[model samples]
Target chain A: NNMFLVVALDGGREADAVAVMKAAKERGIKIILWLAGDVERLKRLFEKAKELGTDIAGIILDGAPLEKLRPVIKLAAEFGAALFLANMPDAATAEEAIKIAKEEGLEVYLLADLDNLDTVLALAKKYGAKVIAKVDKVEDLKKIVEKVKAHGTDILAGILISPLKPEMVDTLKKAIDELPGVKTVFLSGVSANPALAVEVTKFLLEKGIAVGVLERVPPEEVVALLDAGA
Target chain B: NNMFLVVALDGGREADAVAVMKAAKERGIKIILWLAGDVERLKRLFEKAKELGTDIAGIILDGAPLEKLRPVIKLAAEFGAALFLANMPDAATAEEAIKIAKEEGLEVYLLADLDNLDTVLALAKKYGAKVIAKVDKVEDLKKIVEKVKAHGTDILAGILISPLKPEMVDTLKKAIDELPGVKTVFLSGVSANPALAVEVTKFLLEKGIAVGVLERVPPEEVVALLDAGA
Candidate 1:
């Protein structure tokens, strides 16, 4: 229930990055390093983490050109971290990235928005990559469910929604009812306001949905969510 | 030096909102409540806080209709909270809102993005409202400073940036050097990564610029930044 991902923006200053890694290790939190198409920097960061014996749970390669995907995926595999592809332009690019990740024996996670969900899910189904769909509006939940049903549930790893609104609870509940097989629903943006976050987490847990709070949530809220039986 | 703002998305459910207000009171943190056009809901929230004797520092009226601006501003004044106008569409709409806020004998804060920065800053100077300019890129810093210079610096309340990148540090240093009269620059989006946030806050403090960490930042990072002399 303490399942959540902490995003490290980039391998910033080496000392700062190492400090974040050490903090993550001490807190038993997983690090999802978000790199902006910098393969050499990725190598340096992973090397430093290795020397320090710090664990990186995942890597999100954002805005990486198609030519760089294979090496990034290979490096992620070498470091034993899960790989995710973000900011991919089209289905063709997504297919290629997923193809390369599969070749490296890694299960890739593809980030999907409403605009790209259908194509992304189709590619995920064809290439055996899990999708982390980003949900924006209440209407989006139904559309997402429809897409998930069409593509098969196995292709969906999680659904991510941000800035949770109280009015969204009903639609989310209905959507989750249709998605009984959903592994996890990741909540973000509301964590900055802890009280709302705790209340929303409790409500979702009561509905029997496995919840994960992603990126920018405080560690205290994570503990509170866990205490509420996330 | 600990001049940061925490945004509470909405009043939410009464119990939840009350709990948040209590937490803010205990932490000595001011809340900028973001509400959608519902004046009655705003009234109820402020009334409840008054009954509880809790403090609300500011109110942001998002998606509020033009006809409702006067009432919202009056209510904000009644509640002793500073008023802010967000989600304004055009210069005409902004002028109207600022006019209403002035009629209520209160200064309004207008949220400005790049497209509307010039018009917003112009209106801020003409109507005597403060502008909080949102910067998205390294190049945006220069544009913001230019606008702030063009509009008297007295109209510029703050500059807010998000998801900060290491590469932007050099440009930010240059921008801050040019704007020595600036009051506070708010950093968001990076606080989820505490190590980078602390490092950035220390860097800003060393340069004699005041820094404020905005929404979604963890309290622990706030303490870390304060200790770093934010």
Candidate 2:
């Protein structure tokens, strides 16, 4: 009824979230699914993926400590899966990447050098996504709207809708799961408007989809969405 | 040449262990793509998906710890949106999901224990995949497979081919993913045999894919033989 950029409150925070995500499939938005935390946590994470019904523009794994993350990464590689690495140009060990995905028969992500648009383009280009390209922070409603529209075509899915409560996400899923031809669910509000994001996520979670990792994301949610996924 | 399953070893490994995933699609296998890493990673995953070219049934966000996993999940949900939550069991959730999905939506994976699947079946009969009841672990595969088959051509997408490995499994009949009239392939594996799984996964990863999460399968490279796909 009202115009809203519905973030997928993950695990079915709302059907719209994933539906919007589907919409961006063609546009070439980079959809990254970041994996932070530990091994058991990673297992839970994967389970959650089964729940979300994972899609891939691409995948990026980060935060899960190098050594500890190996098992999951290796397993992911077994499927020829790709990932996003947090080691941005300046992040710790950014330059120390093994850069073995291509050679290793895996697709993965690494931090880009935002300082140079050329580097950004060069790096992001490989993934084939509709990236915002060199804009940080504040995009006016018009700019934000444009970015949303432009990047709308290409999106990477991540746990961006983390700010919301898992319960709310379940309710949203209940409503969205039955919709047909739902392309994608825009979840900018979750990041843009934390309050709405939380409230909405709460609604979905309560409905269903709660194994563990229920309420544990906030500011990171926006960063997750900025990656441009459902 | 090789008596391999011909898994797509692509589609970020969503389909069954090979092109069988596509075959499964025709058989009504619900396919879902969830980006579990970063936007960049997910981006390439999808880009590769475009290159591999396959048909999918549904996309949902399952599990992803990293903040990035959300975006890609969202993106896939937006794109090739399926009619409902592949194979769920929540008429209310399904109806609500449909209502909410006017723009976009997600597949709901409700964690409910239905001792008697009759009521669930009746509800499912009404809306189809309104509320998906997922069961991980190979233990439930056979029963789930039979039940789904009986329940009107039920199929599964993102059917991780972990069980597809050799020795660990026997090619009973022809494996669900390998059924007939299939479309494209998402991703497959060499086999559940850890070594082969790694090898196959690595093989596809080079092409494009982030092994952020392991589906425990081997590369099947099914597209090579798939008949009905883009």
Candidate 3:
């Protein structure tokens, strides 16, 4: 089930973003736009990355102005980066997001971390939007899957795993295999080094477990590590 | 897309676990075991929970001694909680984790946050173990999927989303839909308050994104928010 290699891009200087994107592309790493600062600057980074022939996975906008929503959608189209809707303060904004997704013909995601279950359930049912759950630790795996399954809604799982030792391999393994009902399981966490995370990821991949990486480790390094290892 | 309420049990006195578990059941919020400390005491809490007719999703063990592996497995079987193997130091240890999974007849996970990618790949290819990659941000969604797609491996994605605002709904949406090749997209982040995060999450779910939540938010409150809101 080992399948995905994700690289998260946090907010940095535009030049730094360019450098990282260039390096990631050369090393076969993926790009994720995750950072805070000026949305315009972030958009600039996306444009630069696109020019560099880099493939972007998605963009997570934490504090962008809702007034700029349509423009950002256009920007995403230009850069070929997907948008992950992080927050919407009121019903009016949520309504707008749906229209945008439809107009752009782009699939959108919802965060279950803050939303009430009923709201998420009804909205997901009505709009055909995707839902991503926030998992704090490994334990929440099965229960959340079942919760989603009962609702008959599509769900993906996110987990934090980092600065971890080599001894807990099985814990990670079961998260993918034994945990029933989730279509996929993703690992999230900061670690002392990328090597440790990469190693654990390789082990899962070799065994054929379905898993994904967040930018806990550098994406380019992940690419290099996996490519070189392969 | 809106599924999962992960509860980590850590640093509390033994009785605290039981109290939370009881509260979770009362609130219809499922509990998963993630964190470290006394395994025996944790087992006792599980036993107490079971006796109270509580259901536990799984347990995560980080840096636990290998010698304690068997007992933990046994405990899991009795309580019907899945085991997630996080953190493994070396190839030698990886093999042991696999054997444990097979013997226990339970699927397990491997954390790719440690060890060497080369080592992990070889071991996975040779032994058929499962690996999960850790993602740091939401931006790397696409390239990672492309990386694994080329490799013909199965993959999952995890992301961090915190200090996010309500206006960024569309961004979350595209992360699920536009980011091609991943089996699923997961969201992880810490929130200032559950209300804002919950509202944002609900919007995504309403849009029908299959996203998982793993976060700094209280998993129990997540369940309650959903359940109560539902």
Candidate 4:
């Protein structure tokens, strides 16, 4: 089942990855790790994948080869957790990655270049990716919604709580209605920390914005939809 | 099982994760997911997981709302895979999560703050984790090794080519042998894209490091290991 989290690791020894697998295992989660590199290095990545691997989850490989960005049009069809090509090399890389993931029906995320907000905004529209940013005040998000509408990217707006206060629930719901592009919000990243994710998510729902928590995913698709801001 | 791969969708609508799960079923890899945040919002992740999650690997509830993570984990385990936790909010949180996991003989990987290289190094040391970094030249690696060794870090040299790249591999071997903390040297992080992680790992073994690939893992333990570097 594609129920495990598809965690993308930068790179280290196989045991390094194993350590992470071990930890994730305790939580009873399935996992898939992708390494992006070359044939010479592929063996090492596989070995490490095996070492840290267990009856819980497994690993994949990537990196260090090929410059083509759009070749990744079909990885999402994979049935279980996997590591595909590097989509974060640049905006185009991310875009091409999303395009293929969408084609495959994965809820993929666009790892927008935080520094290039405009490019990110455009890419979000093109890919329909959502964002998980701090919305302390509903007004903070109003600016982004306004931007999306101004550009009419048709991209969606998604809220991610930064401080994640209990009261933010009302604020989030209020923002959800006012925000132009946003349709739903999801708890991502550190939200799952210390179990605060669950509580914070509940609070968000009670106030207004519809939200969901991810247990595990066939990451490619999840990432795509997340990028589409669906 | 000749099974393919599956990806998950977290933030999108129920249909989002579902699409990916459907694709996974088509490909043959099992589908599973980790619903991280809000319980009420878990519809998409849960729906998809259930629909295609048969032959599940496992489920992990990171920040915990056991309702989702628990069931998935059990399902994955019952399907012949173990379950695990990736990382937690803090060390204590990890300690608590491990109490149950240790009984299961699962592996664990605790990721350190990405921006904080020092913390990453520290955590790796604490866990006996392995690492691979870019050394501009053999000499640069020597310097890095010295510094790393001074700090009591364990590092591997390189996983060379099948025919042996000669000087590079030789020097790497020498450096590793010269250093007391360095134990083994093998290839890692050489891939064209993340999807080739397993293939790259194979390349590493060609250079020789002794690898054994395990199968039927729910894929929970190793996911984070692959993620550590990414």
Candidate 5:
């Protein structure tokens, strides 16, 4: 059972990606193929996703750390996907990315540290960068949200969900629900088990919390679980 | 018992001022008389200290604010004292004060926050400003000292001693002794009672700590406490 799901991929096997996209179609999960290694490797993977006619949400330039900015932007443009820099250093860098993202007519998701959240939000507010606050404490989420709200008018306060265990469903649901100004929730540090991902996707879906699981889980399983039904 | 001691006074009544200075002479306690109210009032107090043959350390211009900068500097010059602004805003302000103090051939002693100890020490290093770090944690004194040592060289880490009760002497003494890089120990929140001040001063003196009590304790008591031997 999947709802508002997104998957990360480093350029790899074509058949697996096709199958993954096919499954994702059944459950309406967003696909985000990240370019990590060689530019040619990413292009091949991008061609496969293009062949399957899958629309990606964003392209994350990270993982194996190869820099091919213009080529990746062109590939993203072809797919009608947004561009996100996983290695964005500071507010100035984020602002530069915003210029590129705007030129391409694509949205950019940027990470900001909570310590200098106000200053980052100022840059975001001025330059239209969607800021994601990778929060640490589950308990201080609401207060942090309020403080962010005071400083920012249009910034998205995205929180990274800690790994979900089957036992913590109710507690996690309650805690996540109580937190305000949480416009987006994404999952990273995902378990390999599709069964676990399905369980978590179901939990977040049931509570109407938007969920997106990053790299670890294969795209086919994410799509397969969605097809199995929520 | 006393170590290095100092007393502060506003431009004030004369009969008691002489008594305070006479007592201070017996124990070698430094006196700093700050100007208050009218410039006329300050000149009179300066004359009284002058008549009594009292050597003031610095003229602290904070008690009752006035804009007679040159006149006050001249008064301090006559008394062989330095002009000190007790309400220095930041490192930049302290640096400027050092410039002014240096022009007059005075050894500048400027207070700085321990949180920004490194940068403040840098300003002090470049100029002749003798920086005093009004530290935060008494228990974490050693760790703070080590951190300061990492940042500064040939600098005195000044720590504030909270009011000492006779019962907590060893606890205070042990904590004070463990702190390295502590070139100065200053007491501010002192009890008005000369007996208690004497007791705390004795504890500090026995440890061979160079001490100075600031604004809170009465000048008479600071002198009286120092007059009695450890």
Candidate 6:
């Protein structure tokens, strides 16, 4: 029940996007549609999803310009979809996006880098938003937990281990074991190899950690992971 | 010339793959086709490329099973394309794949993580293979260089800074400056946002570090990065 799926739509045909949404709806798989485009395209897709009566769990904006962030947030709010900043570049951008999303009374998610961890966590606390801190190594987990504890666990949504490698599994587990109160962990860039992805996903699930994988993972592997009790 | 572009084909239509190959060939892009599938599918795609007389700079086998590693290496050898092991999991697997590739008299590339850095580098040295060590943070770069120096720079082809964040730019540049004899660097997971991708790519290029971006990047941004003198 703690698992989530994300379907990314990057400049594909509108009909294709609609087809994906329809399929997900029929399959009873709630997905966060990561839409990559400008404000107009975002609005068009949001309208299309509304027309199809699709149930979107969330929407992440990729390739959206800073100036267009406000309108996109407004669109997400209008659609009653939670909004996520794909990868927040700086505190300034994070503040602006979170402020806009907060003003509209929408649930906000920030995908922040480890380098900007403290500042982003501060911003997350200020705006009452959740953060998915992008972690690269086991060592960074200590700093992440320290910052999260300082800012309080309510501001943290989860931890995302990008480019998760096989050898890092034990280290990741150790880090997660000592983590203050992180319940969810997501993995990116590991889905390129489906076998490895399934192994790691199952490992994390067995540890009682709510784990999620990126959309690039093949559908069969995703099902296999689900069957593993995800 | 130090930069390379990769176009990944993940079960897209044959016609689409052919179209991309044709466009890349016509434009003299010299792209590496990262084909994700089983052995038979890989053979079919390799045959198709041969029929089209497309000159692929290299070929990476993604989602390929460990048992099928030899066949894939043979196929790459038959096509006279350099073979890259996409994220080598362990030394045993790395040794097996590298030995196969070396027996076929082909140039081999390894995408290795920081945890297995020493073991992978030792294997690379034994097999006379080149490695693109995946660096997730600035701190890890020092460890990477230390391991590379121990194994010798002749085995290290490049360093891949994955999920490159904007805030990590200055730190990455500083780490890269201290790296011994590493010329080419590749970036993964940074192309989702074209503007930031362009900015980071340009920054790396200006620093005389030959930088490459993943295939998920839009064609327009690739062109812009090219024009920026990559």
- Name the runs in model 3 displaced over 4 angstroms: A1-11, A35-37, A114-118, A153-175, A178-185, A192-230, B1-230
lDDT of 2 by residue, A107-156 (tens): 54433213433343344445442222222222222233333334342332
- Candidate 1 lDDT tens digits, B27-132: 6656666553335657877987787676776787654556667887888888888887865655577778888788888867887878788888788778877888
Q: Model 2, B100-122: lDDT tens per residue? A: 44334444332222243334544
TM-score of chain B of 6: 0.80
Consecutive 10-residue window with the lowest summed lDDT within model 2 chain B = B1-10
TM-score of each predicted structure versus truth: 0.49, 0.29, 0.42, 0.32, 0.40, 0.48
In candidate 2 the C-alpha lDDT for residue A170 amounts to 50
What lDDT tens digits, residue by residue, belong to model 4 across residues A118-152?
56666556755554333445555556556656665
Models sorted by TM-score, best on top: 1, 6, 3, 5, 4, 2
Native-interface RMSD of candidate 3: 17.4
Candidate 3 chain B, poorest ten consecutive residues by summed lDDT = B189-198
Q: Which tens-of-lDDT digit does each residue in B1-230 have in candidate 3?
A: 32333555555454555666675565343455765656777777787877887777667666666676777777777777766665654555657866776677665555443224344434555545544444433343344444434443533233334334323333444554543323322334233222223333333443443333443234344333322222
Worst 10 residues of 1 chain A by lDDT: A221-230
Candidates' DockQ values? 0.06, 0.03, 0.02, 0.02, 0.01, 0.02
Question: For model 3, how does the per-residue alpha-carbon lDDT over A44-126 read when each residue is reduced to its tens digit?
Answer: 77777778887676666544556767776777776666666655566567667757865787666665553354575566667
Clashing pairs in 5: B1-B230
lDDT of each: 0.66, 0.36, 0.51, 0.40, 0.53, 0.65
DockQ of 5: 0.01
How would you encode candidate 1's per-residue C-alpha lDDT over A1-230 as one tens digit per residue? 44555543331133445555566566665567655444665787788778867777678765455766788888988988888787665557767878888888886888887877888887777777788877768888888888888888677776777656666667877777777656667776344356666776776677665566455332323333333212
What total of clashing residue pairs does each candidate reach? Answer: 0, 187, 117, 142, 1, 0
Clashes of 5: 1
Candidate 2, residue A41: the lDDT equals 38
Best-performing candidate as measured by lDDT: 1
| After superposition, candidate 5 runs with Cα above 4 Å error | A1-8, A63-67, A163-183, A192-208, A217-230, B1-230
